[PDB]
Paper text:
Omega transaminases (ω-TAs) can mediate the chiral amination of several unnatural substrates without the requirement of an α-COOH group and are highly relevant in the production of several pharmaceutical intermediates of commercial interest. In this work, we successfully overexpressed and characterized the two recombinant transaminases TA_2799 and TA_5182 from P. putida KT2440 and solved their crystal structures. The overall structural fold of the TA_5182 and TA_2799 enzymes is similar to that observed for other class III fold type I TAs with two α/β domains. There are two highly flexible loops present in the structures of TA_2799 and TA_5182 that mediate the entry and exit of the cofactor and the substrate/byproduct into the active site of the enzyme, leading to significant conformational changes in the enzyme structure.
Author numbering:
A (entry chain A): 5 to 459
B (entry chain B): 3 to 459
Write the structure that this text describes.
């Protein structure tokens, strides 16, 4: 059987229209090279999304392969239960502690960001039980947030299509307004005034619920999967100021913004966030190995230790927690990012990247352009004057996603917002190639949107 | 002075399933190198890994063919996702291979990284399918005391081991836990195993009728309870449980994350006990843990409802970044190929009688209350009084000693409170078995002296 035939017979795809899949079948990706991937027939595509916002070092970094191979040949697997450990997992924990801001000094490993955020929920409940605060358990998130796919993590997620028919949220979570200035600012309202309203919304909820029942706020510094939405001016100062006055932990999900994506090593630096807990994945390993990390404070670790003293063990763990090959790849991935000063590279490249995005502001299909560092979004709308969404949201974005392949370009459509998140290794020439292909794609999409009567 | 690894670990690493307070005092044991069924620490001490790590390293700790499979895939495509119709050859081939191996019409496969994610995915799929069918009340899960199904919030709610719930506010989804099917512990005086099975089936049916079958979506269970104490089911259990579930249209979810790929002497434990699952979950031996991978295999009927939902909702809005990871799935494919090529299921069938006899040699030992096991899994439960089956005053005190002391005799086992578990790699030889139990004999002698001096008896 062909790969296509194996796929159509047996594979349930994630985040895919499974009915349309029976008709159109899969696109088989066969090979990676730098910022490009190739399908089974040999067609080339510039991967302007780094896959899933994650392949920081591109798709053929032999030094990551080498790190995996070297570890495989010594010890291809061992666990970290019952005091057992391995050298890469311990070295990576120490490295993440050295990189993370403030007293974020203690690291717990998982396979995925979803597991990591599940672990945060469990750790926070555990610590507040240990502290004699058994009521202090509710989480606060936001509309359009993305924090993962497990039952708890997807309850923190605030994208409504990810809740529909899954009975989510299934744990106590409140979702604030999405901090999207373009979409929700009032006529003539400044970004600062929008932030005032968002911060007051958060505090109004805390006071109505009772702060003694609220354990934590979780958020991405920039909302990615929900639409590439940078925060409005002053937002993170205001949110932290509120949370600090109620002993509400600030959990910062850096699974996409971490490791240079915004032009600083962690997005928390750019926005002046001091997290109580920081969550990392994706560019942590360039997704060459499944790995995520939860980084917590000395104070939180001390409570975890006092719990083991009275309960006998920290009764939480995954079979591959601390996997020696996964953590060895991450350690090498970080070393490359530092040795090659890729954070500095993003700083150098971000202006031309952002300029290319904003060149489309006057385009007939474009309602808003936004972006920070090496992440960007171009939101297409049915009417520029009224910011009107399309009658069936995603109709035009879905076309752009498909049609870009014909021009050798992979982007990701978030309904009708076109996302860009290319590898940290992207060059000036790569940027020009991305936008040449996107120009051709958007010209096709203009003909298509007009014929389809979408505008 | 401590090694750099020890210093790094003590400064920064939060350990899973570890006493974090004791860890500050005793520090970590650094495992450095693998060699077949053995591992070596940083000091050069050697250990026969009688647990395959975490019940999982089926091919042992130095199988170069799995390394080769990872390398060959790394050189072509080190990562790509499976969202938005994208796919890769190893994930598609592995899906087809698992569908070919799985019983009945378990023909459709969803990939995750971990068993916990997989069981979380099962919970979501079951709720999704029941909403799709216009049955919004049919959502409750049934599990069992001492079950283990993972560590995420939902999966750990299905887990029935109380220490894994304590201070975590679990269960946190609707679940009911039946009696643990442990004949040694819960049989009445003179009761046969078949009679105990009847009582367990009637317990399940009474619960269903009292709750309302229209509110109950699924039963989940391991064929043999592993992390909960190596507890095989009593005679006829699975036939009886399945019949009740079928009577009330309750899905049967079989968690083969440990029993899968030959552990019990059949490719899947469902064959040994005559289980036909609606959903089967796989991990661990799937890759010998060389790569994080798990799989959910569902029936045609389940898949048809998932497809009808995408028709009306636009997408199956569920997925992990590394779902279907090409390196992880390529390693799993080669792992299965080696199991088949070397007929390791047949090898387990040959080893199992010898292994089980070595376990039962300890039945008459003064510390041993019960010996149990099937295939290449076994457990030796230590008790304070054999006549009354009395647990120890502080459960785990003796088991913890045995765990520590076995290292001194070159042996790694796992203590489940005071039950000693054995689950060696599929590649274990008869010589290896003799070495395991020679070292365990010496450890149990040490423990008998220690238990006496400690006044535990």
């Amino acid at each position: 059987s062909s790969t296509v035939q194996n796929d159509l017979a047996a594979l349930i795809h994630p985040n895919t229209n499974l009915a349309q899949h029976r008709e159109v079948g899969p696109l088989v990706i066969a090979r990676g090279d730098g910022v490009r991937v190739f399908d089974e027939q040999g067609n080339a595509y510039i991967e302007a999304m780094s896959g899933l916002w994650s392949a920081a070092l591109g798709f053929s970094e032999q030094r990551l392969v080498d790190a995996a191979v070297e570890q495989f040949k010594q010890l291809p697997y061992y666990h970290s239960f019952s005091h057992k450990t391995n050298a890469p997992a311990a070295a990576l924990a120490a490295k993440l502690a050295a990189l993370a801001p403030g007293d974020l000094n203690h690291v717990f490993f998982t396979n995925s960001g979803s597991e990591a955020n599940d672990s945060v929920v469990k750790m926070v409940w555990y610590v507040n039980n240990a502290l004699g605060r058994p009521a202090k358990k509710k989480f606060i998130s936001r509309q359009q947030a993305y924090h993962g796919a497990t039952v708890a993590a997807a309850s923190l997620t605030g994208i409504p299509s990810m809740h529909r028919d899954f009975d989510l949220p299934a744990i106590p979570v409140h979702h604030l307004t999405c901090p999207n200035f373009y979409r929700f600012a009032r006529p003539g309202e400044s970004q600062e005034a929008f932030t005032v309203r968002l911060a007051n919304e958060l505090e109004r909820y805390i006071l109505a619920e009772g702060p003694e029942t609220i354990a934590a706020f979780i958020g991405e510094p920039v909302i990615a999967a929900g639409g590439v939405i940078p925060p409005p001016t002053g937002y993170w100062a205001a949110i932290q100021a509120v949370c600090k006055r109620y002993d509400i932990l600030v959990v910062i999900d850096e699974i996409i913004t971490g490791f240079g994506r915004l032009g600083t090593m962690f997005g928390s630096q750019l926005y002046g966030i001091q997290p109580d807990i920081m969550v990392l994945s994706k560019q942590l390993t360039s997704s060459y190995q499944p790995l995520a990390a939860v980084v917590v404070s000395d104070a939180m670790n001390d409570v975890l230790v006092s719990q083991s003293q009275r309960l006998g063990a920290f009764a939480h763990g995954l079979t591959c927690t601390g996997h020696p090959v996964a953590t060895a790849v991450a350690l090498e991935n970080i070393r490359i990012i530092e040795e090659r000063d890729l954070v500095g590279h993003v700083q150098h490249l971000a202006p031309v990247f952002q300029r290319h995005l904003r060149a489309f502001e006057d385009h007939p299909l474009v309602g808003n352009v936004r972006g920070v560092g090496l992440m960007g979004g171009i939101e297409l709308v049915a009417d520029k004057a009224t910011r009107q969404p399309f009658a069936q949201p995603g109709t035009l974005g879905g076309y752009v996603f498909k049609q870009a392949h014909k021009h050798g370009l992979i982007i990701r459509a978030i309904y009708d917002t076109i996302a860009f998140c290319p590898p940290l290794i992207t060059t000036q020439d790569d940027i020009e190639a991305i936008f040449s292909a996107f120009e051709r794609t958007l010209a096709d999409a203009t003909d298509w949107a007009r014929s389809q009567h979408l505008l």
